[PDB]
Amino acid sequence: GSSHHHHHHSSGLVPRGSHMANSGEAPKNFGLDVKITGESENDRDLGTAPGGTLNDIGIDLRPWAFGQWGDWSAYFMGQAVAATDTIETDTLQSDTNDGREPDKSYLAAREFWVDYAGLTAYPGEHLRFGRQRLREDSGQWQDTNIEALNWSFETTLLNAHAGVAQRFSEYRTDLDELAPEDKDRTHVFGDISTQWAPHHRIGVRIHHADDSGHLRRPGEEVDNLDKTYTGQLTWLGIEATGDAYNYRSSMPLNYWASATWLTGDRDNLTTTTVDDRRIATGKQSGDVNAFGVDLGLRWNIDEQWKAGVGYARGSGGGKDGEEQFQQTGLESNRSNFTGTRSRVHRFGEAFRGELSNLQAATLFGSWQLREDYDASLVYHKFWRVDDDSDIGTSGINAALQPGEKDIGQELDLVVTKYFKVDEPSALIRFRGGLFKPGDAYGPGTDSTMHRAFVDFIWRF
Ligand SMILES: CCCCCC[Se]CCCCCCCC(=O)OC[C@@H](O)CO
Ligand SMILES: CCCCCC[Se]CCCCCCCC(=O)OC[C@@H](O)CO
Ligand SMILES: CCCCCC[Se]CCCCCCCC(=O)OC[C@@H](O)CO
Ligand SMILES: CCCCCC[Se]CCCCCCCC(=O)OC[C@@H](O)CO
Ligand SMILES: CCCCCC[Se]CCCCCCCC(=O)OC[C@@H](O)CO
Ligand SMILES: CCCCCC[Se]CCCCCCCC(=O)OC[C@@H](O)CO
Ligand SMILES: CCCCCC[Se]CCCCCCCC(=O)OC[C@@H](O)CO
Ligand SMILES: CCCCCC[Se]CCCCCCCC(=O)OC[C@@H](O)CO
Ligand SMILES: CCCCCC[Se]CCCCCCCC(=O)OC[C@H](O)CO
Ligand SMILES: CCCCCC[Se]CCCCCCCC(=O)OC[C@H](O)CO
Ligand SMILES: CCCCCC[Se]CCCCCCCC(=O)OC[C@H](O)CO
Ligand SMILES: CCCCCC[Se]CCCCCCCC(=O)OC[C@H](O)CO
Ligand SMILES: CCCCCC[Se]CCCCCCCC(=O)OC[C@H](O)CO
Ligand SMILES: CCCCCC[Se]CCCCCCCC(=O)OC[C@H](O)CO
Ligand SMILES: CCCCCC[Se]CCCCCCCC(=O)OC[C@H](O)CO
Ligand SMILES: CCCCCC[Se]CCCCCCCC(=O)OC[C@H](O)CO
Ligand code: NA
Ligand code: NA
Ligand code: NA
Ligand code: NA
Ligand code: NA
């Protein structure tokens, strides 16, 4: 059930001989996830800088181990990667610089945790401690592997979670340092929701991020391992879904609606450039009072075909920047929002937008056939909310022109074959995004950019 160590994995594969494959089998105490990935990426900077291009291939091996003893259990997953350049074999990976340059080949400890399920007799209730997968269904608050203590309670009528998390390391042979935004940042979070009618859920969610770190002092040189800000930030959200992320729905329509208020304060570092160097000049504090919304509707046209629409907006700008929404930093923004077994990036495989000073309109269609195939075609159009503010993270490394709201448009295609089928144990997927920059990117930029993957995944 939901406590299974692979429950949140997007692949949704089931190894041969496992208890999930045949309930008469004993739970596996070990297994191996094998992934071969090709990536083509051109050009992440839209042709405004050297590099930014990938055409490369890699293998990623993830052995895992599991033990169970009454109410106690424990889990480890490691990772070994070898690739022809530094490609993305992990949709959850740390974004990347002395101590932050990935190697083409590396080892990592991905998960390591102990779990106690004995506080209540519900097997949907358990407490997990260690580096662990945290995920909620939208992917927009948490979808990551992180050191945490997290309590889950999942039953028919009531779901609830509460946890604390903090990065202390990447646990990787190549990344020696944390990203500055992660260093000394503690997260606490929880949620509670109820299935008020069958397949309809309403809930509230909270997340708090607190920075204990400090900013560089005036006159000190500032480099890429230094923070740009320290924050005490709270996200408070309402969320309603009707089979929003359920690829097996029988309802004719599915939907999601969420609204999130972001409050708190940030201390923003200021800098100046002095002879090929960046020098701290001070800092400025200010309130954040920002808002985000994400809405979607999916038509289940028949057992195979689905289509739908989405709108999302993260506020931007405002008085002294108070309306600049931002996400938690634990999100993936990947979800099953097209109604298939495959997860898709909600704001484009190429653009990979964070909901921050961003408005997006989305159209999609999908097709699936039992547990054997699925395919999705997604269109997005993106605009800034405030044309004099930056946006947040994205898969595009290029300057925005002041005063231009047209970020661009994107077309994505995801196509998947599942192999042994009752429950597949392997898959091959094409996942690609084509991004057409709009006027906010300005002259001298490429007319289109793409990011495309082929992934072959086998679980043993
Ligand atoms: C598991 C993944 C395997 C997938 C195999 C797909 Se092969 C087609 C990839 C399509 C990539 C085309 C880019 C080729 C290129 O342009 O090479 C530079 C050239 O000018 C001279 O070096
Ligand atoms: C230092 C350079 C050496 C690397 C050479 C190996 Se390129 C491995 C293929 C990597 C390209 C795969 C990306 C996805 C894609 O473009 O598939 C197109 C196809 O499936 C549509 O029919
Ligand atoms: C840094 C972390 C510390 C390293 C070790 C923690 Se993982 C070893 C867990 C292994 C513990 C298994 C034993 C529990 C038990 O009760 O087994 C008896 C049997 O009768 C029950 O059915
Ligand atoms: C400063 C660096 C310290 C952090 C390093 C993490 Se410990 C080494 C990775 C520990 C994770 C164990 C799993 C890796 C693995 O064994 O993959 C091998 C593959 O050949 C199996 O088919
Ligand atoms: C607030 C939630 C806490 C949950 C903790 C549970 Se797991 C921590 C076990 C392991 C702790 C490892 C510490 C390693 C380290 O500090 O190395 C730094 C270096 O890699 C670069 O930062
Ligand atoms: C049951 C769960 C329900 C979740 C649904 C939330 Se719908 C939020 C309505 C959105 C209303 C917010 C108004 C924002 C605004 O003023 O737009 C800026 C304008 O000044 C410049 O274009
Ligand atoms: C069915 C259950 C009821 C669901 C209630 C959700 Se109605 C969404 C109203 C939308 C509210 C927008 C608030 C905007 C904000 O707080 O940040 C910007 C500003 O305050 C900084 O000057
Ligand atoms: C109708 C559906 C469109 C949806 C977007 C799928 Se991404 C398009 C490229 C994905 C296909 C393979 C990657 C292309 C490639 O390798 O060429 C490199 C070369 O063009 C350098 O610009
Ligand atoms: C900071 C949080 C703790 C991290 C724990 C890493 Se546990 C490594 C794999 C743990 C999975 C089981 C370990 C030992 C075992 O199972 O021996 C008993 C027998 O084989 C049962 O079948
Ligand atoms: C019963 C014990 C079973 C666990 C054995 C698995 Se090997 C340890 C991998 C998981 C533990 C993390 C290892 C990497 C690390 O600690 O690096 C921190 C940083 O480099 C320091 O600053
Ligand atoms: C089964 C054991 C569970 C017991 C642990 C309960 Se912790 C509740 C999680 C909820 C997370 C709390 C967040 C608090 C916050 O962020 O307030 C900041 C303030 O508003 C700034 O203005
Ligand atoms: C059968 C009834 C049991 C009642 C007592 C059980 Se206390 C469980 C501790 C942990 C409960 C989780 C708390 C997280 C939360 O509800 O916060 C979300 C929201 O944002 C808040 O504003
Ligand atoms: C089996 C029975 C379980 C009963 C548990 C009920 Se959980 C439903 C919560 C859904 C209630 C929505 C409350 C709206 C709200 O307080 O948001 C304010 C906004 O976020 C502040 O800015
Ligand atoms: C990027 C690709 C474009 C995405 C389309 C966006 Se919305 C289309 C959903 C609306 C489609 C639902 C209508 C199906 C229907 O009308 O069935 C036939 C008739 O009613 C007998 O039942
Ligand atoms: C690349 C994979 C996805 C392709 C994009 C699909 Se766009 C619309 C999706 C679904 C619409 C397609 C037609 C639906 C149908 O065939 O049945 C309609 C019948 O009139 C009612 O019973
Ligand atoms: C290099 C990347 C490859 C990624 C996956 C390509 Se799968 C072709 C899907 C296209 C599926 C169209 C029709 C499918 C169907 O109905 O097949 C019945 C089936 O054979 C019953 O076994
Ligand atoms: Na398994
Ligand atoms: Na298992
Ligand atoms: Na470039
Ligand atoms: Na329990
Ligand atoms: Na669906």
Looking at ligand 10, which residue's alpha carbon is closest to its atom 6?
76
- Residue 12 maps to a domain: no
Q: Indicate which technique resolved this structure.
A: X-ray
| Spatial separation of the C-alpha atoms in residues 229 and 214, rounded to whole Å | 8
- Residue 106 maps to a domain: yes
- Record the resolution, in angstroms: 1.7
Contact of 161 with 354, CB cutoff 8 Å? no
Looking at ligand 10, which residue's alpha carbon is closest to its atom 8?
109
What DSSP character marks residue 441?
G
Domain that holds residue 167: 19-459
Residue 380: CATH number of its domain: 2.40.160.100
The atom of ligand 6 lying closest to the CA of 295 is: 5
Span between the terminal Cα atoms of the chain, in Å:
19
The atom of ligand 12 lying closest to the CA of 161 is: 12
| Spatial separation of the C-alpha atoms in residues 330 and 135, rounded to whole Å | 9
> Beta strand pairing status for 54-69 and 143-154?
unpaired
Coil, strand or helix: which one is 414?
Answer: strand
Query: Which residues share a beta bridge with 123?
Result: none
Number of H helices, E strands in the chain: 0, 20
Q: Among positive and negative, which fits the CA dihedral 91, 94, 98, 102?
A: negative
Contact of 357 with 385, CB cutoff 8 Å? yes
- Residue 14 maps to a domain: no
Using CA atoms, how far residue 112 sits from 62, 70, 139, 183, 375, in Å, is: 13, 19, 21, 20, 34
Q: Ligand 11 pocket test: which of 154, 208, 263, 265 has the largest number of ligand atoms within 8 Å of its C-beta?
A: 208
Instruction: Find the 431 Cα to ligand 17 centroid distance in Å.
Output: 24
* Burial of residue 285 (number of CB atoms within 10 Å: 0-12, 13-18, 19+): exposed
Instruction: Find the 160 Cα to ligand 12 centroid distance in Å.
Output: 6
Looking at ligand 14, which residue's alpha carbon is closest to its atom 4?
364
- Residue 150 maps to a domain: yes
* Burial of residue 274 (number of CB atoms within 10 Å: 0-12, 13-18, 19+): exposed
The dihedrals phi and psi of 196, each to the nearest 5 degrees, come to -80, -25
- Residue 7 maps to a domain: no
Fill in the amino acid letter for 56.
Answer: D
Contact of 457 with 426, CB cutoff 8 Å? yes
Q: How many domains does the chain have?
A: 1
Instruction: Find the 16 Cα to ligand 16 centroid distance in Å.
Output: 22
Answer yes or no: is the C-beta of 188 below 6 A from any ligand 6 atom: no
- Residue 11 maps to a domain: no
- Residue 2 maps to a domain: no
* Burial of residue 225 (number of CB atoms within 10 Å: 0-12, 13-18, 19+): middle
- Residue 438 maps to a domain: yes
Structure tokens of 198? 């069958």
Q: What is the dihedral of CA 17, 429, 132, 59, to 10 degrees?
A: 90
Structure tokens of 433? 């995004």
Instruction: Find the 203 Cα to ligand 12 centroid distance in Å.
Output: 11
What's the 3-state SS for 65-133? EEEEECCEEEEEEEEEEEECCCCCCCCCCCCCCCCCCCCCEEEEEEEEEEEECCCCCCCCEEEEEEEEE
* Ligand located closest to 84 CA: 2
